């Protein structure tokens, strides 16, 4: 009928364990893990083993995984027990549950039975960390990193505490001193904490927001034509200049090629010292400023 | 170079502790087949 | 749709005696197959939570937790 309703149906099909049961599973899971590593090291070093001993060693490797999976399936209810408390903070319940299961996995990987502590005592840390670590990683569409997500929560914490001490929302200078940071830092943090909004959202009636965004780089027909008319006007001026003079002005700004060129690079094509190119440039520019040549382009200024 | 289940196990128990554990586990299967 | 009208009081004797005035109400009751308080509370349970095996405690807290607290 419902997705989550289906998952709880199946996790409940495994009976919860007791302390002695946990310790045993934690032993077999550990022996199988060492039995596996032992055999791998042997091939590198040689060290063949008794044909029979190797047989029941490989079975211990195989047997440890049943202990691993049996231990996980028994404490799945614990994950859901912890995940419920974090719904509605930007993550679906199932995603919280799965990330919690990841923490449960490591808890099993890192569990120590010799300490004699109940499993739920230690596994709760890993499930809680795996869920919150996941929320910082995913809950936001723009994905602030963890340390920055940590300072945001700490800042809001401070504002909350202070608000009760002061009776009013604090000013940036007060939060800056209370957190031991600069007032321009806390302001920069409050800009990061902004969360996005949906274009597909609608605003009054039947009009989605998305239809109001301008395309900035869209070609504006009134300017692109004048640009074409402008580059034709410049083509006229070049015919008035000396053939060497017109060639220099282009290459310096790369009108034909589309890329500028430095003087030394303009010296190779014309086989002259780069200073001479600078001199020719200066004389030709001043002549371009001459009253006759530039009169038309004044109006084309903007 | 990840951090694997072996690394996490070796960090908390020496090879002599693991070896003695393996010996116990080996004797269990040893008793099963040998002793009725 | 159309839970038997009798199952609700079974969820909560002499059901016929106190309401003997209505002839049709007794006709619907005669058509109701459930008998007893716990046996019919399972009938009403199956439709409220489709997919959960009832518990002896959950059956009784089901009806009271729903509408009376």
Curated annotation (Swiss-Prot), chain B:
Keywords: Antibiotic resistance, Transcription, Transcription regulation. One of its GO terms (molecular function) is bacterial-type RNA polymerase core enzyme binding. It comes from the Bacteria. Induction: Constitutively expressed during growth, increases slightly in stationary phase (at protein level). Disulfide bonds: none annotated. One of its GO terms (biological process) is response to antibiotic. The keyword Transcription regulation applies. Monomer. Forms a complex with the RNAP catalytic core, specifically with the beta subunit (RpoB); its binding site may overlap with that of Rif. May bind free principal sigma factors. Belongs to the RNA polymerase-binding protein RbpA family. Binds to RNA polymerase (RNAP), probably stimulating transcriptions from principal, but not alternative sigma factor promoters. Partially restores transcription in the presence of rifampicin (Rif) in vitro; overexpression leads to an increase in the Rif tolerance in vivo, with smaller colonies. Seems to act by removing Rif from its binding site and preventing its further binding. No longer stimulates transcription in Rif-resistant RNA polymerase (with mutations in rpoB). This is RNA polymerase-binding protein RbpA. It comes from Mycolicibacterium smegmatis (strain ATCC 700084 / mc(2)155). The lineage of its organism: Bacteria, Bacillati, Actinomycetota, Actinomycetes, Mycobacteriales. The chain holds residues 77 to 112 of 114 of the full protein.
Curated annotation (Swiss-Prot), chain C:
This is DNA-directed RNA polymerase subunit beta. Mutations in the RRDR sequence (residues 423-449) confer rifampicin (Rif) resistance. Rif blocks transcription initiation but not elongation. Belongs to the RNA polymerase beta chain family. DNA-dependent RNA polymerase catalyzes the transcription of DNA into RNA using the four ribonucleoside triphosphates as substrates. This subunit often mutates to generate rifampicin (Rif) resistance. Interaction with RbpA partially restores Rif-inhibited transcription; once the subunit is Rif-resistant however RbpA no longer stimulates transcription. The RNAP catalytic core consists of 2 alpha, 1 beta, 1 beta' and 1 omega subunit. When a sigma factor is associated with the core the holoenzyme is formed, which can initiate transcription. Interacts with RbpA, which partially restores Rif-inhibited transcription. It comes from Mycolicibacterium smegmatis (strain ATCC 700084 / mc(2)155). The lineage of its organism: Bacteria, Bacillati, Actinomycetota, Actinomycetes, Mycobacteriales. The chain holds residues 221 to 293 of 1169 of the full protein. It comes from the Bacteria.
């Amino acid at each position: 009928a419902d997705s989550v309703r289906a998952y709880l149906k199946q996790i409940g099909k495994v009976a919860l364990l007791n302390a002695e049961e946990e310790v045993e599973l934690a032993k077999r899971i550990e022996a199988g893990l060492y039995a596996t590593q032992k055999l791998a090291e042997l091939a590198e070093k040689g060290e063949k083993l008794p044909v029979q001993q190797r047989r029941d060693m490989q079975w211990i490797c195989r047997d440890g995984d049943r202990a691993k999976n049996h231990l996980l399936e028994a404490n799945l209810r614990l994950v859901v027990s912890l995940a419920k408390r974090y719904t509605g903070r930007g993550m679906a319940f199932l995603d919280l549950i799965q990330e919690g299961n990841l923490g449960l996995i490591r808890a099993v990987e890192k569990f120590d039975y010799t300490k004699g502590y109940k499993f739920s005592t230690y596994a709760t840390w890993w499930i809680r960390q795996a869920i919150t670590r996941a929320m910082a990683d995913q809950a936001r569409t723009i994905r602030i990193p963890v340390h920055m997500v940590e300072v945001i929560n700490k800042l809001g914490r401070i504002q909350r505490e202070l608000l009760q001490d002061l009776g009013r929302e604090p000013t940036p200078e007060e939060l800056a001193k209370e957190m031991d940071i600069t007032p321009e830092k806390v302001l920069e943090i409050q800009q990061y904490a902004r969360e996005p909004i949906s274009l597909d959202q609608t605003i009054e009636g039947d009009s989605q927001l998305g239809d109001f965004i301008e395309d900035s780089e869209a070609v504006v027909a009134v300017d692109a034509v004048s640009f074409t008319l402008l580059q034709d006007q410049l083509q006229s001026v070049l015919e008035t200049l000396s053939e060497r003079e017109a060639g220099v002005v282009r290459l310096r700004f790369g009108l034909t090629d589309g890329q500028p060129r430095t003087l030394d690079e303009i010296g190779q094509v014309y086989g002259v010292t780069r200073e001479r190119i600078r001199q020719i440039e200066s004389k030709t520019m001043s002549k371009l400023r001459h009253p006759s040549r530039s009169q038309v382009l004044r109006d084309y200024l903007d | 170079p990840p951090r694997t289940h072996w690394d996490m196990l070796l960090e908390r128990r020496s090879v002599e502790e693991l070896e003695e554990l393996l010996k116990e586990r080996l004797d269990l299967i040893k008793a099963k087949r040998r002793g009725t | 749709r159309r839970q038997p009208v009798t199952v609700l009081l079974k969820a909560l004797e002499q059901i016929v005696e106190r309401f003997g005035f209505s002839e049709i109400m007794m006709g619907t009751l005669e058509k109701d197959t459930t008998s007893g308080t716990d046996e019919a509370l399972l009938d009403i349970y199956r439709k409220l939570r489709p997919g959960e095996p009832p518990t002896k405690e959950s059956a009784q807290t089901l009806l009271e937790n729903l509408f009376f607290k």
